[PDB]
C-alpha cells in the first residue's frame, strides 16, 4: 500500500473566495505523475489536472495546481458555483495506483427557509396494500436539518425514510424527502397527519398537514 491523503475533507466557500485543497504522498514520488480528478454528483471522475500543473481540456484557467515532493495542492482563484464538486488526487508512479480520500467543496449561501409539502397516499397504492404519507421539503439551506412526523401528537416515527439531495446548481440549496410508511389498518386509524420541520431559519417550525380531502 502507497498512500495519498487530503487536507481537508469538507470545505465551505463564499462565491469569490480562494480555495486550496492539498494532497500528499506517503513516499516521495514525482510531481509529474500526480493527476487530479473532479467528480460532480450523479456522474464520473472528470480528469481535471494532469502533470502537477497541467489543466485538462476545458478546465477553467482560474484553477491552479503545484507541488514537488510529498505535498501537492490545488487552488481555485475565485471560487464560483460550478466548482462545487468533490475533487480527488491520484498516483500513477508505481503500482498500485492509489487515490486520495477526495476533498468535498461546496458553495456558501444565505440561510433560506424550505418549501415543505405533504402529499397523502396515492389512489393506486392504497388499494394495492400498504400506504405512505409522503412529505417533501424543498430548497432549504444549510443541510444541518432535522424532521419528525407526528400524527395526533404522539410523534409516530416508524417507517420514516429520510432521503436528501446534493446541492442545486441553479439556486444551490438542498432539498429532502422522507416517507412514513404504514400498513393500512394503522392508516384509517388516525387523522391529524402533520409534517413539522425544524431548521435554523424560523424558531416557529413549519407544519404542512392534512386531515381529510379524500374521504
Amino acid at each position: 500500500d502507497i498512500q495519498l491523503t487530503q487536507s481537508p475533507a469538507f470545505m465551505a466557500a463564499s462565491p469569490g473566495e480562494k480555495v486550496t485543497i492539498t494532497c500528499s504522498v506517503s513516499s516521495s514520488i514525482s510531481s509529474s505523475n500526480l493527476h487530479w480528478y473532479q467528480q460532480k454528483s450523479e456522474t464520473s471522475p472528470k480528469p481535471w489536472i494532469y502533470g502537477t500543473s497541467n489543466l485538462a481540456s476545458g478546465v477553467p484557467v482560474r484553477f491552479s495546481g503545484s507541488g514537488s515532493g510529498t505535498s501537492y495542492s490545488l487552488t481555485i482563484s475565485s471560487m464560483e458555483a460550478e466548482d462545487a464538486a468533490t475533487y480527488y488526487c491520484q498516483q500513477w508512479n508505481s503500482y498500485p495506483y492509489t487515490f486520495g480520500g477526495g476533498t468535498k467543496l461546496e458553495i456558501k449561501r444565505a440561510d433560506a427557509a424550505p418549501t415543505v409539502s405533504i402529499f397523502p397516499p396515492s389512489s393506486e397504492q392504497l388499494t394495492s396494500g400498504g400506504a405512505s404519507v409522503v412529505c417533501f421539503l424543498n430548497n432549504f439551506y444549510p443541510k444541518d436539518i432535522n424532521v419528525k412526523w407526528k400524527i395526533d401528537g404522539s410523534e409516530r416515527q416508524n417507517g420514516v425514510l429520510n432521503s436528501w439531495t446534493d446541492q442545486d446548481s441553479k439556486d444551490s440549496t438542498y432539498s429532502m424527502s422522507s416517507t412514513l410508511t404504514l400498513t393500512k389498518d394503522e392508516y384509517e386509524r388516525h387523522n391529524s397527519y402533520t409534517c413539522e420541520a425544524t431548521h435554523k431559519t424560523s424558531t416557529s417550525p413549519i407544519v404542512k398537514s392534512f386531515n381529510r380531502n379524500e374521504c
Binding site: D1, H35, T43, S44, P45, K46, P47, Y50, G51, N54, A56, S57, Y88, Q90, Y95, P96, Y97, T98, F99, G101, G102, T115, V116, S117, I118, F119, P120, S122, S123, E124, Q125, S128, S132, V134, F136, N138, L161, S163, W164, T165, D166, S175, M176, S177, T179, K208, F210, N213
Partner: protein, 218 residues
C-alpha cells in the same frame, strides 16, 4: 479525442461471473495502457486492473484484492477491452470506469462513464410508481408541487424523467434508499403558480430489469 463506451453491467448471485467491456474509438494509438478503476460508497475509487501495451503484446498487473479473481484482456484487432471477473463478492459491487491513457510524452488519459455491478444474493423486482398530486391545497406562494414515489424494485440502476424529459426546471430526483433488500426513491417537480390543466404532466420511469411505467396527476 475519444469515445469509450462500456457495456455488460448488471447483478449476479455472489460467486457469479461477468465480462465488462468497453470499445475504443478514435484511438489507434500505436502505444497506450488501459485499466479498470471502480467506485462504491464503501471504498471511494480504486485502481482494480490494467493490461499494458507499450508494444510488448500483453503485460498485466492487479492488486491486493482482485488478483486470482479477474483478468484484463483486450485485443486491438477487436477494438475492445474485456474484463472478466470471477468468484465475486459483496465487496466488489460498484461502478467500473474504463480509462485509457496513451504514452505520448504528455497529454492526459481519458475515462468513460461506467455501469453498475451488483453482487447480491437476492432477486430482481420491478418498481411500483405512484402519482403524487396534491391532497387539498398546495399553498406556499404561487406554484405547485407534484411528485412520484417509487417503491420496491431491486437491482440499483434506475431512471426517472418528468414528461419525456422535456421539463427540467425544478425537478429533484432523490438518492434512493434501501430497507429490506428493496429500494424506494421519489422525485419532484414544482411547476407554475396556476395549478395547470395538470393534463399534460406525466412522470415517466425506466428500470432495466424489464419495466417502464408512466403517470398522471389528479
Amino acid at each position: 479525442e475519444v469515445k469509450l463506451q462500456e457495456s455488460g453491467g448488471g447483478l449476479v448471485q455472489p460467486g457469479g461471473s461477468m465480462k465488462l467491456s468497453c470499445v475504443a474509438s478514435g484511438f489507434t494509438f500505436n502505444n497506450y495502457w488501459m485499466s479498470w478503476v471502480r467506485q462504491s460508497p464503501e471504498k471511494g475509487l480504486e485502481w482494480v486492473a490494467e493490461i499494458r501495451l507499450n508494444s510488448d503484446n500483453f503485460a498485466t498487473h492487479y492488486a491486493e484484492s482482485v488478483k486470482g479473481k479477474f483478468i484484463i484482456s483486450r485485443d486491438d484487432s477487436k477494438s475492445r477491452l474485456y474484463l472478466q471477473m470471477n468468484s465475486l463478492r459483496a465487496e466488489d459491487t460498484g461502478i467500473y470506469y474504463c480509462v485509457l491513457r496513451p504514452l505520448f510524452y504528455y497529454a492526459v488519459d481519458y475515462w468513460g462513464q461506467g455501469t453498475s455491478v451488483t453482487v447480491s444474493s437476492a432477486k430482481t423486482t420491478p418498481p411500483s410508481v405512484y402519482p403524487l398530486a396534491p391532497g387539498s391545497a398546495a399553498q406556499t406562494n404561487s406554484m405547485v408541487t407534484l411528485g412520484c414515489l417509487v417503491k420496491g424494485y431491486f437491482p440499483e440502476p434506475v431512471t426517472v424523467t418528468w414528461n419525456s424529459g422535456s421539463l427540467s426546471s425544478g425537478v429533484h430526483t432523490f438518492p434512493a434508499v434501501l430497507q429490506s433488500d428493496l429500494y424506494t426513491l421519489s422525485s419532484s417537480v414544482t411547476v407554475p403558480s396556476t395549478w395547470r390543466p395538470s393534463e399534460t404532466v406525466t412522470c415517466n420511469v425506466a428500470h432495466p430489469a424489464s419495466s417502464t411505467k408512466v403517470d398522471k396527476k389528479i
